[PDB]
Design a protein around this ligand. Structure first.
Ligand code: HEM
Ligand code: HEM
Ligand code: HNI
Ligand code: HNI
Lengths: 141, 146, 141, 146
């Protein structure tokens, strides 16, 4: 469960991401595809090379979903309901991949938040991304 | 990759008693039932709408047999699983776009299927040898991914 | 979530296990220690010899906890609360190991339930063990 | 575990800029803060009760130096990580009883620390190369478990 401090930390860190959320989303995807090539099996229809317009556009979608989760941090199972259904039923992405993107998102935030990405904040962000991942894999079976 | 002489003989002895048709159909069918997201690769197989439909599906049964036949061939190459599975690794990566986690799931389902069939004969040591095998095969199939 | 159909399947399958539970718990431990030797890193203080009475005793405890969770399948967070506390705070077993014991419990059930371990029952049992595992790792951080 | 030529030089170039003692204390500390069950091996280290208690803990820092020192030495042997880490693998299994999942978690924390320290210089290709390293090191440390 996210603690009061975790939600303070997540809100403050995502606050500092600010207008860069979409850029960071795309960066995290690129990081994931390069670092964990098995994740590319879910995107055979995408251009997955550096500077891809598809990846840039998808990063914005991922970021917006995260912004929404932050705004509804106490009701993620509902706020992300449609997205959970999409991943469980339409995309059928193996649940193991969510930790891979979560790690890539954390790395991206680390690379952009020198003052903000303290150990406590790192812990809270990791918990938050794990919780989003849990919601997104909650309807698989 | 390090199967011991005693593990090797345990694997081969049990395998000599395996009905690869039945076990293959059962393992692939259970994969699709227990982890239904794995059905994503098989829309062309037709009716996968219920457990009974999946299990009895002729295409699931045929593919299960084929997959476990290649697994069985692999057991002749226990010291070079990566070499023997290299072609199928590339295929599943580049042509089929199959996440290698699927191989790991199938391995564990195959272990359940063997336990179900053999009962007490699938002893803890025999299981442990088979765990080394299914891990090795899954790893070998994942090895050429890029 | 465990569906009403899952709960039906779990209760019937565990009903069939009956007084063999304790034995099956110990068997699943033995299977875990052999198949997944990294799990033995949590038991260096145990006697792991063949037929170990300590392992047998422990298997009974594990089984009794599962029997209780089945009996309280509509409210497992509360039924397993003290046990969740114990794993999160005292034992501190890495969450990754719960899937390994869960698999070994499934294999044990398969080896002892020829008639009952149908594909649908297998699915429900797997979900049930994952749900137990979820509760037992819920307080880790 | 196969790094390309450009990946090997990227790893080496970045590591030349790393203060190993510092980064090691930071990575071990972050491991114990982010995944607090990992504190289970360090009862003798004293106060681990808050993020600051962990991060500034002199024993945590001292241990992080030795851990990352061994890691750093291993970067000179990327083609033989299993050999390099064999005695440490045996030690962590037989004497220290450390679940190898801890090596995986530390790898990922280390990647986060490198990103935090280097900012934009920790590019997606540099990360990809370090992900190969950290996976290879964790697999090597796991390899002699039994
Ligand atoms: C933090 C975790 C994740 C978040 C917040 C997220 C969010 C999203 C969003 C907002 C969409 C667009 C939905 C729409 O079209 O309405 C999407 C689509 C998609 N996602 Fe996820 N996602 C996550 C994890 C993953 C992972 C780990 C994978 C696979 C490695 C994945 C694979 C896909 C695929 C294949 C699509 C469809 C792309 C297309 O063909 O249009 N997602 N995701
Ligand atoms: C289905 C999942 C599990 C269940 C139901 C379960 C249940 C239990 C129970 C009932 C106890 C005794 C608690 C007491 O004395 O009050 C216990 C203790 C313990 N468990 Fe778990 N457990 C599970 C998973 C695991 C896993 C995966 C591991 C590690 C591989 C583990 C390691 C331990 C250890 C080390 C103890 C303490 C043993 C001792 O020194 O007495 N458990 N567990
Ligand atoms: C859940 C997905 C999935 C898994 C776990 C899986 C697991 C495995 C394992 C693991 C032990 C082995 C040895 C294996 C072997 C094979 N697979 Ni896999 N395959 C999978 C999805 C496929 C798909 C999809 C095809 C093509 C099917 C078809 O008939 O078109 C396939 C095709 C094959 C073929 C046929 C290749 C050819 O055309 O010459 C072989 C052999 N395989 N597959
Ligand atoms: C969280 C657990 C944990 C992790 C992730 C970890 C990860 C690593 C990695 C990973 C890159 C390396 C190279 C490594 C190297 C070392 N460890 Ni690890 N160790 C761990 C727990 C220990 C423990 C416990 C000791 C003994 C500490 C003590 O009290 O002396 C240890 C001791 C060492 C020693 C000293 C050996 C001796 O005392 O003879 C080295 C070197 N290591 N450890």
């Amino acid at each position: 469960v996210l603690s009061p401090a975790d939600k303070t930390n997540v809100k403050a860190a995502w606050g500092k991401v600010g207008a860069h959320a979409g850029e960071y989303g795309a960066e995290a995807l690129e990081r994931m595809f390069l670092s964990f090539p098995t994740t590319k099996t879910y995107f055979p229809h995408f251009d997955l090379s550096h500077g891809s317009a598809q990846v840039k556009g998808h990063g914005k979608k991922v970021a917006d979903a995260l912004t929404n989760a932050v705004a509804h941090v106490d009701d993620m199972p509902n706020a992300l309901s449609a997205l959970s259904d999409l991943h469980a039923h339409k995309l059928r992405v193996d649940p193991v991949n969510f930790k891979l993107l979560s790690h890539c998102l954390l790395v991206t935030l680390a690379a952009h938040l020198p003052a903000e990405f303290t150990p406590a904040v790192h812990a809270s962000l990791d918990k938050f991304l794990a919780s989003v991942s849990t919601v997104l894999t909650s309807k698989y079976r | 990759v390090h199967l011991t002489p005693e593990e090797k003989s345990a694997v081969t002895a049990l395998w000599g008693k395996v009905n690869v048709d039945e076990v293959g159909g059962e393992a692939l069918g259970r994969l699709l039932v227990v982890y239904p997201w794995t059905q994503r690769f098989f829309e062309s197989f037709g009716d996968l709408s219920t457990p009974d439909a999946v299990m009895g599906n002729p295409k699931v049964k045929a593919h299960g047999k084929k997959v476990l036949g290649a697994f069985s061939d692999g057991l002749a190459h226990l010291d070079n699983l990566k070499g023997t599975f290299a072609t199928l690794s590339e295929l599943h990566c580049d042509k089929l776009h199959v996440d290698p986690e699927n191989f790991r799931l199938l391995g564990n389902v195959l272990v359940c299927v063997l336990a179900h069939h053999f009962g007490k004969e699938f002893t803890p040591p025999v299981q442990a040898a088979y765990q080394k095998v299914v891990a090795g095969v899954a790893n070998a199939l994942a090895h050429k991914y890029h």
